[PDB]
Ligand binder design. Structure first.
Ligand SMILES: *[C@@H]1O[C@H](CO[C@@H]2O[C@@H](C)[C@@H](O)[C@@H](O)[C@@H]2O)[C@@H](O)[C@H](O)[C@H]1NC(C)=O
Length: 67
């Protein structure tokens, strides 16, 4: 599996578990219907041995369709 830890600046952390089947199907992850803003993502692969280091933060901006 993988864990996706996203957070829109100021808010609290949101999460998502992406399983193998889920990952191979979706070609990664897909985040559906987030309120607008600049989000910060870290990703962490969990293998048979343990939880391996979080990917440095990436930023993604969901459009405001107003402002
Ligand atoms: C999204 O946010 C990135 C990181 O923001 C940085 O840290 C915060 C706490 C503020 O100090 C901010 O001014 C810093 O830039 C930005 O570097 C990035 O450009 C932003 N992304 C978009 C799409 O606007």
């Amino acid at each position: 599996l993988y864990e996706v830890s996203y957070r829109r600046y100021g808010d609290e952390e949101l999460h998502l578990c992406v399983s193998r089947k889920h990952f191979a199907l979706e070609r990664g992850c897909r985040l559906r219907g987030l309120s607008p803003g600049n989000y910060s993502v870290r990703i962490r692969a969990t293998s048979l041995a343990g939880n391996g280091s979080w990917t440095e933060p990436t930023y993604f901006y969901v459009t405001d369709y107003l402002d």
